[PDB]
């Protein structure tokens, strides 16, 4: 009948279609495994061709002057394959006898023996010394599957100097793994083991990390790259140039010492943050090189709370620091003040280059130091808004591009004398006997319980604006003198 | 006249037995010589044979009569599973929607009526595709294509097919220009390009490509015995069982497997073209074409061309549901072939 012929024709068409698809598949396979025959090129079966990820050279964070701030050195580790070891206990004892491996290291290895997904690498020792590396190298052949390897772990030469600002990179745990899975970022993060948990390492984590490389390397025994065939170069993280003056950072920290506190110096003209300071600033290298549970717990319960970056997490009442802005609002309007402050930046994220920033509360009062920095910046600029950015530039084709400020509705009208009124009031407070801060800046050749204070030295065309907090009063002299020599050092 | 008395097709049964034996050997290779997994796979094969034989007995007229009820219960339970946030019933969907579609076609004029019948069939389709795509997209494509083949074989007008093709090919560039917003288009490229973005979704596909390249030559590569390197890609026994097959059998193993799969398809279509009632004429065609969709989708997966999708290789893998549903389809086909008048 008609239906029989119609079905026969339609089935023949479908059969031809599936034959063409089969031809496509067979052509794929012929190209993939016949023409591309060198995909094995493996003379000895024991060799593998594992697709080794290539961690990219993480961007070195510089500062305004240009000197490096956080570096990347080669730290050596003891590595082995659990599934290619003749006897775990004998090998562990041999390690104890050649590199003075401690029983705590054995316990950590066993914890990770199960924690770390099977069929992969497992570390045992950290911060391996050069002598230990030499001993292992000279007696390497006497171990089943143990190999030493150097992995670039972020080094902070100035250490406790910039730890909250620059940040620290710590091990990727299951929570970070699933977080990146949510964003489909495991591809770019397979190689790296340490990933930023705070500081610039986090906010510019993607900027400072970049695309991670990969390679199809035919590794023989001991996991040695010997027949590298395909490898996409790793996009080295762009070397962010912070708006930082490391010398000023060191000076502020040295004059701070025990006094717990935070200092957010800035430059209204360009919008940068000259110096971001937090007192405790736990050593960052501890987190990079396998921080143990004991030390991390000690830090967590430490009364000084080193883990808190007082520049952003520190949400403290500005107290008298808000007087210029309330004055400006009043002059611009003959709870509207809440709306005006929200426009200034209080009660909202400031756009600072720190993802770990607490917005704070705007009663309808706790504002972070960077929030006061932004408010002062707007005050200097006569209402023009500039984000308190820390990224002065980055690496591009030209290797340097200035950070472009995102224009947003400036508060009020620029051509109004109200802003100058607030500036003059602050200048008089800082340079008149009736003012409280006069004693701290009387001798300046150029015009200029928590204890906070913010000011800008060069009244005529200011080039540096500061806002800082002295937590619980610190331990040194009054904050005024501190800012006095800070300003003195800023431009001599 | 014994096989017809039992209501089984000798040729399909023989080819399927050969393919099942080959699958058993491949799983032995891919199971790490695991005795328990091999025992479970043999049990699954036996259950599949039993269900195939049982389904080959009930007459096709009963299939036509009960297709509305089977389809209704399948839709109800798909609505249930999509609700509540048991066993993934997509197999029931991809064995049922072709039945309902073939019945509806059989109850109409010889070729389907343009936008009078084809619209009704597509409307039957859409609830099934929506329910089977809401949790995951993989099985949804199979559920659609399975019965889209039935519609295509029923005589769906070439005018409608061409109009739809032209409209989609004109809408794609519009999607490629107006709806090319950066991250949507980037995600589309990522999904379309599996081998791209290594170390992530493409990590296992690239490992599979390295596996197939290694010992994949026409020289058979290293043969059987797990004399291979295939634990780099996990689940080597369920989805990338084709990767294991390639790396442990060369190109010849792949060619033999594909030859068996195409032989099964040809026999199924050959006995479908002989079916008397149009319902059985188109049901068998739909079943065979969806089987080939399985084969092609999985082999493209492993060879690294199609996007990421969870379509297990037909009846060569670890897993009962896919095996039993394919076996049930083959049983339906043999019943159609043998019951005849």
Residue numbers in the entry:
A (entry chain C): 388 to 721, 779 to 808, 835 to 918, 947 to 990
B (entry chain B): 9 to 93, 109 to 364
Kindly provide excerpts from the paper associated with this entry.
PG assembly requires a glycosyltransferase (GT) to generate a glycan polymer using a Lipid II substrate, which is then crosslinked to the existing PG via a transpeptidase (TP) reaction. In E. coli, the GT RodA from the Shape, Elongation, Division, and Sporulation (SEDS) family, and PBP2, the monofunctional TP class B Penicillin Binding Protein, mediate these respective enzymatic tasks. In the periplasm, PG biosynthesis begins with a Lipid II-specific glycosyltransferase (GT) which forms a glycan strand polymer by linking the disaccharides of two Lipid II molecules, one termed the donor and the other the acceptor, and thereby releasing Und-PP from the donor site.
Here, we used single-particle cryo-electron microscopy (cryo-EM) to determine the structure of the E. coli RodA-PBP2 complex, expressed as a functional fusion and reconstituted in lipid-filled nanodiscs, to 3.0 Å resolution. Additionally, the PBP2 single TM helix, is ordered and packs against RodA TM helices 8 and 9. Analysis of the RodA portion of the structure for putative substrate-binding sites reveals two major cavities (termed cavity A and B). Cavity A is located between TM helices 6, 7 and 9, and is framed on one side by PH1 and on the other by TM helices 5 and 6 and the periplasmic loop (PL3) connecting the two. Cavity B is located on the opposite side of RodA relative to cavity A, between TM helices 2, 3, 4 and 10 and is also exposed to the membrane. The region connecting the two cavities has some of the highest degree of conservation in the entire structure. In our cryo-EM map, within the putative donor site there is a lipid-like density, which we tentatively assigned to Und-PP, a product of the GT reaction.
